[PDB]
Scaffold this motif. Structure first.
Motif, short mmCIF file in Angstrom:
data_model
loop_
_atom_site.label_atom_id
_atom_site.label_comp_id
_atom_site.label_asym_id
_atom_site.label_seq_id
_atom_site.Cartn_x
_atom_site.Cartn_y
_atom_site.Cartn_z
N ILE A 1 0.81 -1.21 0.00
CA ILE A 1 0.00 0.00 0.00
C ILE A 1 0.85 1.26 0.00
O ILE A 1 0.36 2.33 -0.39
N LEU A 2 2.11 1.18 0.42
CA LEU A 2 2.98 2.35 0.37
C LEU A 2 3.62 2.55 -1.00
O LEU A 2 4.28 3.57 -1.21
N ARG A 3 3.43 1.61 -1.92
CA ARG A 3 3.93 1.75 -3.28
C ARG A 3 2.82 1.72 -4.33
O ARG A 3 3.10 2.00 -5.50
N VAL A 4 1.60 1.39 -3.95
CA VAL A 4 0.47 1.31 -4.87
C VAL A 4 -0.48 2.49 -4.67
O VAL A 4 -0.90 3.13 -5.64
N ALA A 5 -0.85 2.77 -3.42
CA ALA A 5 -1.86 3.80 -3.17
C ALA A 5 -1.42 5.20 -3.57
O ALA A 5 -2.20 5.89 -4.25
N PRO A 6 -0.24 5.70 -3.18
CA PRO A 6 0.09 7.11 -3.46
C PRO A 6 0.01 7.47 -4.93
O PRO A 6 -0.47 8.57 -5.26
N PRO A 7 0.47 6.62 -5.86
CA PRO A 7 0.32 7.00 -7.28
C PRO A 7 -1.12 7.18 -7.72
O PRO A 7 -1.40 8.07 -8.53
N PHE A 8 -2.04 6.37 -7.20
CA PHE A 8 -3.44 6.48 -7.58
C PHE A 8 -4.20 7.47 -6.73
O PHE A 8 -5.25 7.97 -7.17
N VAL A 9 -3.72 7.77 -5.53
CA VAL A 9 -4.32 8.84 -4.73
C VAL A 9 -4.14 10.17 -5.44
O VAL A 9 -5.03 11.03 -5.43
N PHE B 1 -3.99 10.68 -8.68
CA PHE B 1 -4.89 10.75 -9.83
C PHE B 1 -6.27 11.24 -9.41
O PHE B 1 -6.89 12.04 -10.11
N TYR B 2 -6.77 10.76 -8.27
CA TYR B 2 -8.06 11.24 -7.78
C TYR B 2 -8.00 12.73 -7.46
O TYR B 2 -8.97 13.46 -7.68
N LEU B 3 -6.86 13.19 -6.93
CA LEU B 3 -6.70 14.62 -6.68
C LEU B 3 -6.74 15.41 -7.98
O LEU B 3 -7.31 16.51 -8.04
N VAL B 4 -6.14 14.87 -9.04
CA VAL B 4 -6.26 15.48 -10.36
C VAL B 4 -7.71 15.44 -10.83
O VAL B 4 -8.24 16.42 -11.36
N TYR B 5 -8.38 14.30 -10.62
CA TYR B 5 -9.79 14.18 -10.98
C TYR B 5 -10.64 15.20 -10.22
O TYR B 5 -11.44 15.92 -10.81
#
Ligand code: HEC
Ligand code: HEM
Ligand code: HEM
Lengths: 78, 49, 111, 82, 64, 241, 379
Positions: free
Chosen positions: D46-54, D56-60
């Protein structure tokens, strides 16, 4: 109150859509949107020439009202 | 069939593999009947009537 | 003297960054040493062939049990992990000679 | 295609044990071990998967908000008093 | 066959020989497919009571 | 930049994953088409035989088809001739060519209603909101002749006069024919005219869920059973001394 | 008579690659997409052939024949949607097949990986050509914008654009050619896929660990056939979920109106599996730059094996590269999200940044990531 049968100039089932629509003009979200619509008209109607008009505020007024009616319109239908 | 020549050893071989060949044709019969609902056949089963 | 070219790394000092990375890499959790996870090219494969039988057989089981752990998506207990200080390069001396041999062979061709 | 069992590699002094599939439970300790395992596995990634996709939601949540906000107008009156 | 558990009688009687293993599959498919349709349709029409053409047909076809 | 109004999500009798179409509403929905839509809108992909088993019986649909004359079949003399329609005939086309349609209206071309539910963003929700969304234009607009203000229509200037009002038609079963009620039936019909497979789509969907809901645990069991040999496998390393 | 020495002097010896093939034991679920891709080919061809028995390529009767398939043909409605959603499942499976190679370093199989890119290019050509077949104002106009990109090629652009078009624009001449081309290409993919396996079985498979698995190989037949069957069902469940519960969830609604060259759709866009490439082309205002960036991004896969730097093969023990890999996946999702949006001021800035980051990560950051860790591991 419409022209179907009986006295009182007959009694045609007034559309439930009209009844539901006025049921949501007193909601807080819809009165404030209507409020902004009123001040827009005074600015535009009293203006001598300007391209602005008052459908965006109307659209926000519609968006709040038309989302309400969807919740409680189909109950009266059929 | 299921043999090579006509001998007692092969006659015993054929008889020993008859019950399996006996019930193997049921799959060819019922399975084909099941595939296309063979009516003449589906008209005799009680639950599928 | 480790970690990063700078005298001090971002997360204080320099030696602890490599220690932190070793636990982050996670190949010690599987019971593998550093040289048990190297890429097997035409160079490393020859340097494996020169390993002593006692060391080559040990490498085989360490890989064999790691794949069992990876198959079950599990790790070794906390006491069975490869300690960073106790991890020693059993393949670096053999790799260096094949580096030396290949460099001489390659450079001799162009002359 | 090529190669097969027999010449794959040289494996020595390794003993393995296994059970018949009919003498062992197919789902042994499913929720007793799998659930504590998945929590362990998820934390390890979760420390290598979540931040990259978190991100993207901020961009969204901002690229979408900007688009509608830019669509909404601003006052542009030049000379009038209501 | 001689065991007090259902599956033991279910295996030796049928699944012991692969010839009869296929028989229960093909025959089981016959009885499953017939019951599943009725089972999976009766539930579907319950969700849609008074909706489909089956439930409003009765007020048509004059004398039928 | 001509902001678009998002159609509301009207609940439907067919909005659920397994909910089906109200075929009683479909029959009333067609009555809107044969009386209001068909005046200047076409539906060239639905036949009079499609209504059999959906909203009308075979005898009912034959009467509907024979009610409208159709032109087909070269006479032995070599000329076209009129005849009552049959079940196989598609819905009549109000105009022969789109050019005639643009001439009948103020240049606007009435779109085909066969797929208009699935060919518009929002589906029946947008269409229902479009039919009932007609309102007086706001102050400060200037609408050309033959153009009406409808906020749900992109551009907020539609070429279609309000086609639905109270008692615009009369229903066979006698439900109140109001502006909202009539729009709902035609929206229900326009969905069936767009997705006739809607009922069978969910009917097979329920069977798949009841099938995958049973096979997936079973297929998983075979996977675990065959793989239980390797999962329970102990390795021992016993080197010489 | 040796049961093991089976009917060998036949085609079964080739089939030993399906039964007795040595495979790593620690194969995860991400490998299942190889077998899923083959099922997607077979499913697409099976439904495609039955679709081709009622589809007619003439412009006057192309769209109307698609309606006749759903409205009239018995059970013809489902076949049309397993084809429309099978392509969605194809590219869902195709992109994870590429992603697994990126993560697990499977591109070290240079022969197999290079044939994989060729396989990828062939499918995107087939999917693009098949989208034009329904001829529905998204087919005509989606093909119009993409095919016109070839006019940017210098000194030969218009010469081959018309040669693709069979005329001065997309018309009935182009439609008939696409249907014939859409019929032949999938059978080419089967031949290449067989070659794709031929370059892999010689060197075996890969494992999530990334080390050689020759010490722990297991037979394929009893362990992976039942693992692929379970994986197949999860594909059938996912594909059938779209077909039976949301058939038009992914497809654009505008495709249901007949193609009209005189009228443009409100928004022009390709299918969802090309939206990631549409954003890159739209990033650069230049025309020649946009088409090159569109091709380079797809063709950058062949350049990946030449950019390897880390001494470890798989990303399992490379935490620094793991942070970058999911940044690339997230960025690829940002490109997909922004591909379907109109070109306005918020998406112009985000579109350029996402595109410039897509190339920057793979070309610069990822090779630098491997070098940093190589220094960090005393080698
Ligand atoms: C007065 C003739 C006429 C009548 C009657 C009529 N329409 Fe229309 N309709 C039109 C025209 C003309 C347009 C196109 C307007 C435009 O595109 O600007 C249109 C457009 C539409 C559209 C497309 C809107 C869009 O955004 O694409 C729908 C849906 C529609 N009508 C539904 C109906 C329904 C339902 C009825 C029956 C209640 C109906 N129409 C009756 C003339 C008519
Ligand atoms: C890898 C193989 C294939 C892929 C990826 C593919 C992809 C597609 C796609 C995306 C569509 C668009 C459908 C829509 O948007 O509505 C389509 C349509 C179509 N395809 Fe294919 N296709 C493949 C193989 C085939 C084959 C082998 C045939 C015929 C033998 C075929 C025949 C058709 C037909 C007739 C249509 C138009 C009918 C329709 O769109 O529903 N396809 N294809
Ligand atoms: C229709 C298209 C394709 C089919 C049918 C197909 C088929 C397969 C199959 C069945 C495998 C073995 C399964 C596995 O090892 O998990 C495989 C392996 C592989 N394929 Fe493809 N493939 C296709 C497209 C691609 C694409 C787009 C790429 C992009 C890189 C690619 C690259 C690879 C690689 C790198 C491997 C290595 C597997 C390993 O390392 O074990 N292939 N292919």
């Amino acid at each position: 109150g419409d022209p179907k049968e009986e006295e009182e100039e007959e009694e045609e089932l007034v559309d439930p859509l009209t009844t539901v629509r006025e049921q949501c003009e007193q909601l807080e979200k819809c009165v404030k949107a209507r409020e902004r619509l009123e001040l827009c008209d005074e600015r535009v109607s009293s203006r001598s020439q300007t391209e602005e008009d008052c459908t965006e505020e109307l659209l926000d007024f519609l968006h709040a009202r038309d989302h309400c009616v969807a919740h409680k319109l189909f109950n009266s239908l059929k | 069939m299921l043999t090579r020549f006509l001998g007692p050893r092969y006659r015993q071989l054929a008889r020993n593999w008859v019950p399996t060949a006996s019930l193997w044709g049921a799959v060819g019969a019922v399975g084909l009947v099941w595939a296309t609902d063979w009516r003449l056949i589906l008209d005799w089963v009680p639950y599928i009537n | 003297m480790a970690g990063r070219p700078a005298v001090s790394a971002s997360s204080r000092w320099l030696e602890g960054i490599r220690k932190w990375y070793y636990n982050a890499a996670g190949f010690n959790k599987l019971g593998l040493m550093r040289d048990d996870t190297i890429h097997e090219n035409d160079d490393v494969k020859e340097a494996i062939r020169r390993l002593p039988e006692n060391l080559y057989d040990d490498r085989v089981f360490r890989i064999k049990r790691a794949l069992d752990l990876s198959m079950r998506q599990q790790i070794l207990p906390k006491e069975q992990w490869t300690k960073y200080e106790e991890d020693k390069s059993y393949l670096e001396p053999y790799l260096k000679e094949v580096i030396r041999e290949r460099k001489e062979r390659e450079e001799w061709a162009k002359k | 295609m090529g190669r097969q069992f027999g010449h794959l590699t040289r494996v020595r002094h390794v003993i393995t044990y296994s059970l018949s599939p009919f003498e062992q439970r197919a789902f042994p300790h499913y929720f007793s071990k799998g659930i504590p395992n998945v929590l362990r596995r998820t934390r390890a990634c979760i420390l290598r998967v979540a931040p990259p996709f978190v991100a993207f939601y901020l961009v969204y949540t901002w690229g979408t908000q900007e688009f509608e906000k830019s669509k909404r107008k601003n006052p542009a009156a030049y000379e009038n008093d209501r | 066959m001689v065991a007090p558990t259902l599956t033991a009688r279910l295996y030796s009687l049928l699944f012991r020989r692969t010839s009869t293993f296929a028989l229960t599959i093909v025959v089981g498919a016959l009885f499953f497919e017939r019951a599943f349709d009725q089972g999976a349709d009766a539930i579907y029409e319950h969700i849609n009571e008074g909706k489909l053409w089956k439930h409003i047909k009765h007020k048509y076809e004059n004398k039928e | 930049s001509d902001l678009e109004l998002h159609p509301p999500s009207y609940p439907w009798s067919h909005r659920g994953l397994l909910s089906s179409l109200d075929h009683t509403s479909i029959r009333r929905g067609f009555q809107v088409y044969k009386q209001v839509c068909s005046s200047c809108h076409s539906m060239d992909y639905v036949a009079y035989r499609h209504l059999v088993g959906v909203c009308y019986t075979e005898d009912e649909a034959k009467a509907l088809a024979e009610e409208v004359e159709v032109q087909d079949g070269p006479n032995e003399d070599g000329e076209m001739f009129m005849r009552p329609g049959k079940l196989s005939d598609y819905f009549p086309k109000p105009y022969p060519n789109p050019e005639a349609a643009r001439a009948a209206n103020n240049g606007a071309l009435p779109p085909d209603l066969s797929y208009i539910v699935r060919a518009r963003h929002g589906g029946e929700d947008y269409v229902f909101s479009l039919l009932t969304g007609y309102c007086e234009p706001p102050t400060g607009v200037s609408l050309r002749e033959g153009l009406y203000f409808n906020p749900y229509f992109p551009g907020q200037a539609i070429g279609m006069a309000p086609p639905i009002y109270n008692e615009v038609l009369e229903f066979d079963d006698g439900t109140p024919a109001t502006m909202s009620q009539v729009a709902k039936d035609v929206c229900t019909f326009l969905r069936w005219a767009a997705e006739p497979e809607h009922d069978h789509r969910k009917r097979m969907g329920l069977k798949m869920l009841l099938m995958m809901g049973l096979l997936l645990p079973l297929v998983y069991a075979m996977k675990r059973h065959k793989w239980s040999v390797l999962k329970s496998r102990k390795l021992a390393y016993r080197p010489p001394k | 008579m040796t049961n093991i020495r089976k009917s060998h002097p036949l085609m079964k010896i080739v089939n030993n690659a399906f039964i007795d093939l040595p495979a790593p034991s620690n194969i995860s679920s991400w490998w299942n997409f190889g077998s899923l891709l083959g099922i997607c080919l077979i499913l697409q061809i099976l439904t495609g052939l039955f679709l081709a028995m009622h589809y007619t390529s003439d412009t006057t009767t192309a769209f109307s024949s698609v309606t006749h398939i759903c409205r009239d043909v018995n059970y013809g409605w489902i076949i049309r949607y397993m084809h429309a959603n099978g392509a969605s499942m194809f590219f869902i499976c195709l992109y994870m097949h590429v992603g697994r190679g990126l993560y697990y370093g499977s591109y070290t199989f240079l022969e197999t990986w290079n044939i994989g890119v060729i396989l990828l290019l062939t499918v995107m050509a087939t999917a693009f050509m098949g989208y034009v077949l329904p001829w529905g104002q998204m087919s005509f106009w989606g093909a119009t914008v993409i095919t016109n990109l070839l006019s940017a090629i210098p000194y030969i652009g218009t010469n081959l654009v018309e040669w693709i078009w069979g005329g001065f624009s997309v018309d009935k001449a182009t439609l008939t050619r696409f249907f014939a081309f859409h019929f032949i290409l999938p059978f080419i993919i089967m031949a290449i896929a067989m070659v794709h396996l031929l370059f892999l079985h010689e060197t075996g498979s890969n494992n999530p660990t990334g080390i050689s698995s020759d010490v722990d190989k297991i037979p394929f037949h009893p362990y992976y056939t039942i693992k692929d069957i379970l994986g197949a069902l999860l594909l059938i469940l996912a594909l059938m979920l779209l077909v039976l519960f949301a058939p038009d969830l992914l497809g654009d609604p505008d495709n249901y109106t007949p193609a009209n060259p005189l009228n443009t759709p409100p928004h022009i866009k390709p299918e969802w599996y090309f939206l990631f490439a549409y954003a890159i082309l739209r990033s650069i205002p230049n025309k020649l730059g946009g088409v090159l960036a569109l091709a380079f991004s797809i063709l950058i896969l062949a350049l990946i094996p030449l950019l390897h730097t880390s001494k470890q093969r798989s990303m399992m023990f490379r935490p620094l590269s793991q942070c970058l890999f999911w940044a690339l996946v997230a960025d690829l999702l940002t490109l997909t999200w922004i591909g379907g949006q109109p070109v306005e001021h918020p998406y112009i800035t985000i579109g350029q940044l996402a595109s410039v980051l897509y190339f920057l990560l793979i070309l610069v950051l990822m090779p630098t990531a491997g070098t940093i860790e190589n220094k960090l591991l005393k080698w």
